[PDB]
C-alpha cells in the first residue's frame, strides 16, 4: 500500500510518500525520515486515507 506523510513543520512543510506492507512498517520509515530531517512533532494516522500527519 502507498502511505502518505503530510509534514506541517515550523520550517519544513510538504508531503512525501512511502510503500509498505502494513502501517507499522510505514510508521517506522516515516519516524526515521522525520528524525533525519529534524522534525519533532505530534502524529496522527487516518486509516481511511492511509495518511500520517506530523505537526511541530
Swiss-Prot record:
Location of this chain's protein in the cell: Secreted, Cell wall
Superkingdom of the source species: Bacteria
Annotated protein name in UniProt: Immunoglobulin G-binding protein G
Organism: Streptococcus sp. group G
Taxonomic path: Bacteria, Bacillati, Bacillota, Bacilli, Lactobacillales
Amino acid at each position: 500500500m502507498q502511505y502518505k506523510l503530510v509534514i506541517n513543520g515550523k520550517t519544513l512543510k510538504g508531503e512525501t510518500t512511502t510503500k509498505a506492507v502494513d502501517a507499522e512498517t510505514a510508521e517506522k520509515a516515516f519516524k526515521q525520515y522525520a528524525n533525519d530531517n529534524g522534525v519533532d512533532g505530534v502524529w496522527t494516522y487516518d486509516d481511511a486515507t492511509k495518511t500520517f500527519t506530523v505537526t511541530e
